[PDB]
Structures are given as structure tokens and as C-alpha cells.
Amino acid sequence: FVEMVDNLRGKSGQGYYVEMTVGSPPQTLNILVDTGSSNFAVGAAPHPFLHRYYQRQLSSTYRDLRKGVYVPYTQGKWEGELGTDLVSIPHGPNVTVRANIAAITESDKFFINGSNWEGILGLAYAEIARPDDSLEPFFDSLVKQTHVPNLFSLQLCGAASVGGSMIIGGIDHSLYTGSLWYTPIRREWYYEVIIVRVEINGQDLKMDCKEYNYDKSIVDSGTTNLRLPKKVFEAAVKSIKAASSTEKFPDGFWLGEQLVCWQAGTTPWNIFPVISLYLMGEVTNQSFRITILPQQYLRPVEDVATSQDDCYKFAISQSSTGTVMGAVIMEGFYVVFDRARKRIGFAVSACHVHDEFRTAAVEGPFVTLDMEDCGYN
Ligand SMILES: Nc1ncccc1NCc1cccc(-c2cccnc2)c1
């Protein structure tokens, strides 16, 4: 896996991407790594934001499936033509598979102006693939056609340029410290998990644990923030404010719309609480917890011209679609998507940012009863 270490790049807030090659002769592309979707879709036309795009007609191995796709979002979309072609990952395993590829021919509010990726690698399951679940996702093809084990792991680091590792087919011990603990994947669609308890500086937020997963909780490398359901978000914000009473901040800061600034080197990290998410464990009545330091949810904000303070935005935001463990969370941990065994592992990342006195942790076991009732139906 030393060949795979450090194989991801990005820019602050624009995701992590991995290099891939498609077609014969091979066309090199940078592809966003997204555990929140299940299509492999690449720019196939010269949208002005793109550095590179897939040219299907130059590939001797391209096969047109004579079928279109349309993926809408709340405001945007992408649309394109379905096909298959040969695909490799230069800094992944030494194999070449025939995968489905959506050739993006028209899009709106999908690509990011300024980014250095040109497609998306959806790593979640068939159930949420478009146009329907018969369009086999990339990883399913990799596993079906090769001897690569049915798992990948992600160490997201980064800081501005970011870096990380996607270890395909295994776990790399050098990428984490302490122990790996596993939560069940509740259902194979998104990487759905169940959060069973939440503490702030060790103190229970005291909500019905169903609130934590209303209407789902997912691990999503294609979202930056920790996103929390509205009722959970308000309790957490209330509790973080209290812990940090010592200073007052604008309403807008808690909304992600305003920064908070301190003289360089004087950020009062001590007044911001650690957040603990307890996840359903592998054994009946057993759970474990992952601990988030504030340097994960207080996000440094690049350059406000002639300001030599340290300025930060709040990287916890509200969700109406359940809890989302986005890059903010994932950057604290080495995360193992153990598809073969329907489970997701967490261990403290070897590249997590340190606090002067407090230590991130993945710890257990804890006794939590009725953990199934925490799941939303
Ligand atoms: N996984 C995911 N979660 C929320 C929204 C979108 C999404 N995936 C598709 C997608 C499309 C375009 C850009 C991005 C993106 C933008 C910024 C950071 N990471 C991913 C994600």
C-alpha cells in the first residue's frame, strides 16, 4: 500500500480527488472521491471550468450503452451518455477493469470553478446509482473482475492544498494510531450508520437518539461539514456557546456566514468543547465513541487581505436530511469502508491536528441498550 499512500489531492473546501485513467490509450483524469454517491461520471465536453475531459471517441475500448442519464440536484444537475470503458488507478492496485462511465455532456452547478478535478467517483452502493440500481458502480466492478478485497480506506489530511490516501483493498497500519473500532453499515445505499449518543465535554446532549439519525446518518467524503439535524444542531450550538461563554460571537458565525478572529497564536482552543459521537458497535448492546477536537469544527479561513489574525468559520451546519459526517469529521480519523463485512471502521488518524492538551480518541466498549431504536424508520 506504500504505492497508494498520499494518492489524494485537493484544495480547501473542494474535495479530495484521485488520479485515474480511462480508455485506450489511457486518458489521465482527476476524479473526486465521493462516498455519498454511486456513479462514476466524468466531464466529456469542454466546459470552461475543466482542465481535462474524457474523449470517448479517441478510446478504442469505449462502448456506448446507447442510454442517457440525468442526475438532478436541488439547483444543479449533470446529464450524459452511459458507456463502459477500461479504467485504472495509477496509484492504486495494479489492475484494469471495465467500468460503467457516465460521459457528462451538459451540466449546471456541478463543476467547481478553480478546482482540479473533472469527474466524480461514486463509491457508495447500487441502490442510489442513476438511472437505477442496475448500473453497476465502479467499486463493485473492481471487486467482481479482480482479486482486490472488497474494501477501501481513507485518510483525509490537508493543510490551500490538501492531501490524503485512498487505500484500496486494505488497511495501512501506518495511517492510524490506537485501535480500529467498527460500526455496522445499516443498509447498503449510502454508507448509513447509527449514532446512539452524543456528548459535549463529556456531557450528554440528552436527546432521544432517534434525533441523531433523523432521517439518516451517513459518512460522506463529498460534504465538508459536520451536518446535524435541525434539533440536534440547535442543542449542540447551545452547548458549544455555553462552553465558550467567556467570549461572545455574532449570530452569523454560528450560521457559517461570519468569521471569528484572534491575534495570531492566541486562539483560545481550551474554551471550545470536544464532541463525542457514540456509534453502534458490532456486538449487541455495545457501542464505541469517536471524539472530535475543536480544531476540526473551527475551520481556518484563508486570506482576508491585510489581516494577520487567525480567523475561523464554524464547520458544523444544520441538515434537513439527517446527520452527515463530512470531511470535517473524516479528517480526524482513518476510516475503513469494509464492504465485505458491512461495516465502517474508525481509528484516530496519524495526520489529525493536535490540541496542546487534549487528545482525539476512538474508544470503547460502552453499554448502550436498544440501539436499534436509534435508527429512523
Ligand atoms: N456526496 C455529496 N454530498 C452532498 C452534496 C453533493 C455530494 N456529491 C456530489 C457532488 C457534486 C459536485 C461537487 C461536490 C463537492 C463539492 C465540494 C466538496 N466536495 C464535494 C459533490
Curated annotation (Swiss-Prot):
<dbReference type="GO" id="GO:0005771">
    <property type="term" value="C:multivesicular body"/>
</dbReference>
<dbReference type="GO" id="GO:0120283">
    <property type="term" value="F:protein serine/threonine kinase binding"/>
</dbReference>
<feature type="modified residue" description="N6-acetyllysine">
    <location>
        <position position="216"/>
    </location>
</feature>
<keyword id="KW-0256">Endoplasmic reticulum</keyword>
<dbReference type="GO" id="GO:0016485">
    <property type="term" value="P:protein processing"/>
</dbReference>
<feature type="glycosylation site" description="N-linked (GlcNAc...) asparagine">
    <location>
        <position position="94"/>
    </location>
</feature>
<feature type="glycosylation site" description="N-linked (GlcNAc...) asparagine">
    <location>
        <position position="113"/>
    </location>
</feature>
<feature type="modified residue" description="N6-acetyllysine">
    <location>
        <position position="230"/>
    </location>
</feature>
<keyword id="KW-1015">Disulfide bond</keyword>
<feature type="disulfide bond">
    <location>
        <begin position="209"/>
        <end position="374"/>
    </location>
</feature>
<dbReference type="GO" id="GO:0005769">
    <property type="term" value="C:early endosome"/>
</dbReference>
<dbReference type="GO" id="GO:0008233">
    <property type="term" value="F:peptidase activity"/>
</dbReference>
<dbReference type="GO" id="GO:0043525">
    <property type="term" value="P:positive regulation of neuron apoptotic process"/>
</dbReference>
<dbReference type="GO" id="GO:0140448">
    <property type="term" value="P:signaling receptor ligand precursor processing"/>
</dbReference>
<dbReference type="GO" id="GO:0055037">
    <property type="term" value="C:recycling endosome"/>
</dbReference>
<feature type="disulfide bond">
    <location>
        <begin position="157"/>
        <end position="351"/>
    </location>
</feature>
<comment type="similarity">
    <text>Belongs to the peptidase A1 family.</text>
</comment>
<dbReference type="GO" id="GO:0050966">
    <property type="term" value="P:detection of mechanical stimulus involved in sensory perception of pain"/>
</dbReference>
<feature type="glycosylation site" description="N-linked (GlcNAc...) asparagine">
    <location>
        <position position="285"/>
    </location>
</feature>
<dbReference type="GO" id="GO:0005794">
    <property type="term" value="C:Golgi apparatus"/>
</dbReference>
<feature type="topological domain" description="Extracellular">
    <location>
        <begin position="1"/>
        <end position="377"/>
    </location>
</feature>
<dbReference type="GO" id="GO:0060134">
    <property type="term" value="P:prepulse inhibition"/>
</dbReference>
<keyword id="KW-0449">Lipoprotein</keyword>
<dbReference type="GO" id="GO:0098686">
    <property type="term" value="C:hippocampal mossy fiber to CA3 synapse"/>
</dbReference>
<dbReference type="GO" id="GO:0005886">
    <property type="term" value="C:plasma membrane"/>
</dbReference>
<keyword id="KW-0645">Protease</keyword>
<keyword id="KW-0325">Glycoprotein</keyword>
<dbReference type="GO" id="GO:0008021">
    <property type="term" value="C:synaptic vesicle"/>
</dbReference>
<dbReference type="GO" id="GO:0010288">
    <property type="term" value="P:response to lead ion"/>
</dbReference>
<keyword id="KW-1003">Cell membrane</keyword>
<keyword id="KW-0967">Endosome</keyword>
<dbReference type="GO" id="GO:0050435">
    <property type="term" value="P:amyloid-beta metabolic process"/>
</dbReference>
<dbReference type="GO" id="GO:0008798">
    <property type="term" value="F:beta-aspartyl-peptidase activity"/>
</dbReference>
<feature type="domain" description="Peptidase A1">
    <location>
        <begin position="16"/>
        <end position="347"/>
    </location>
</feature>
<dbReference type="GO" id="GO:0099171">
    <property type="term" value="P:presynaptic modulation of chemical synaptic transmission"/>
</dbReference>
<feature type="disulfide bond">
    <location>
        <begin position="261"/>
        <end position="311"/>
    </location>
</feature>
<dbReference type="GO" id="GO:1990000">
    <property type="term" value="P:amyloid fibril formation"/>
</dbReference>
<keyword id="KW-0333">Golgi apparatus</keyword>
<dbReference type="GO" id="GO:0001540">
    <property type="term" value="F:amyloid-beta binding"/>
</dbReference>
<dbReference type="GO" id="GO:0034205">
    <property type="term" value="P:amyloid-beta formation"/>
</dbReference>
<feature type="active site">
    <location>
        <position position="34"/>
    </location>
</feature>
<dbReference type="GO" id="GO:0005788">
    <property type="term" value="C:endoplasmic reticulum lumen"/>
</dbReference>
